[PDB]
Amino acid sequence: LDPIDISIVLNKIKSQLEESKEWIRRSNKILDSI
């Protein structure tokens, strides 16, 4: 049978997670300036 392949969606989630982490990094950097 053809294998299940959800790599497209998993790779998308990994990409959105990296974005989420960058925003939190930016938030904390601003808080550090206070």
Partner 1 sequence: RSDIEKLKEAIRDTNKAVQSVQSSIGNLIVAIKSVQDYVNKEIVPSIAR
CB of 13 to partner 1, least distance (A): 5
CB of 2 to partner 1, least distance (A): 7
Residue 34: partners with Cβ closer than 8 Å, 6 or more residues away: none
**DSSP helix/strand/coil, 7:** helix
- The count of other CB atoms within 10 Å of the CB of residue 20 is 10
Positions in 1-20 near partner 1 (CB under 8 A): 1-7, 9-10, 12-14, 16-17, 19-20
Binding site for partner 1 (CB under 8 A): 1-7, 9-10, 12-14, 16-17, 19-21, 23-24, 26-28, 30-31, 33-34
